[PDB]
């Protein structure tokens, strides 16, 4: 017998492969597995781990987010890397000439980036021209902006959104929500 201080046969809890059957994604995973093994650059390891992520853990990254990231000093000539989708944004009216490498570009995002003088690039061409992740800039999208996150942690005084179908007066705005009707949360 052994006095087990820890739970036995415990899986790491991390994805080691994409959950999908996309063969082109699996080819990208194979390429960045080779790069994350034969190169010591932590960029290839971070890109490889991001290639395993689910959809909610790969939020889209807008072109306005990319332009804001390019307003940083020393980052004008960098290569923006989005392991996921670059969506479009009409809120902006100027776009810098830059190189963006991403899994997917929406039609609007690709048009805006190309019209700005830049180029859209896949992660394999990213690997070819920047094998060690030279002057790259990895961007991620907002994960807690998801609508499901609003209801996480519901409870008294937590200030969270109830899981509700119909919204308005007569829908959970009474006893328990105001002092005049019983109490307030």
């Amino acid at each position: 017998g052994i006095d087990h201080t820890s739970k036995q046969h415990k899986r790491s809890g991390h994805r080691t492969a994409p959950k999908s059957d996309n063969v082109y994604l699996k080819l990208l995973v194979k390429l960045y597995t080779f790069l994350a093994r034969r190169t010591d650059a932590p960029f290839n390891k971070v890109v490889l781990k991001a290639l395993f992520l689910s959809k909610i853990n790969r939020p889209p990254v807008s072109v306005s987010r990319i332009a804001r990231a390019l307003k940083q000093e020393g980052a004008a000539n960098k290569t923006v890397v989005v392991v996921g989708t670059v969506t479009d944004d009409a809120r902006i009216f100027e776009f810098p000439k830059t190189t963006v490498a991403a899994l997917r570009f929406t039609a609007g995002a690709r048009a805006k980036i190309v019209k700005a003088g830049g180029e859209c690039i896949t992660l394999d061409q990213l690997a070819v021209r920047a094998p060690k992740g030279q002057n790259t800039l990895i961007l991620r999208g907002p994960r807690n902006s998801r609508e499901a996150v609003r209801h996480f942690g519901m409870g008294p005084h937590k200030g969270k959104a109830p899981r509700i179908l119909s919204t308005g007066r007569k829908f959970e705005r009474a006893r328990g929500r105001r002092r005049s009707k019983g109490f307030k949360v």
């Binding site: 017998g1 052994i2 006095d3 087990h4 201080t5």
Partner: protein
Amino acid sequence: AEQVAAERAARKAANKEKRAIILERNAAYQKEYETAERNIIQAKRDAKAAGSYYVEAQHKLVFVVRIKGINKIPPKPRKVLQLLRLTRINSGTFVKVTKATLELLKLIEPYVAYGYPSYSTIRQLVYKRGFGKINKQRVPLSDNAIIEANLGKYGILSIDDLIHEIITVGPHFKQANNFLWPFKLSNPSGGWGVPRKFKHFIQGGSFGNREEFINKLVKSMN
């Protein structure tokens, strides 16, 4: 001539000078042990001649063997056995003697047998059952290069250097001891010597402090 011999000769020359370093260290450690023993003996003789008494230095090191199974242990001793890394019966660890550790042993006393190891016991234990904890894995030592790869920053280049860092509780004792995996000992070859183990050694049992008799017990256990 694809450049194999040049680095092979560089490696053999490096290995030779490393073995010369280990040899000269081991010679100086042997003379250190020899004088440490002879001085104590001659000090006792001198004190007897002068009519006084020579009280020896209290032992800095103990070896602790968990002699009890894993069922029905109260939480406080269970935690202390986990902290001393005795998770299965007949496991053993070295402990530096301080007030904190002595209270730990005084608290797990009914489940362990401990005492003061000798140089022969430590040497045979490390040579025969010494495994290192390397990248969370239990690696048989079997080579000086492994110990130098994991303890080389502490100046411990060989198994003899590890043994000295255990027998004399050096500055890097904590790192060398934790690098050693908990020794997995067998049951004693001639038995425990008592009808019932779970009394104190003073009361004819097996647990507790049996200070110098731990050597004979551990030798039969490995």
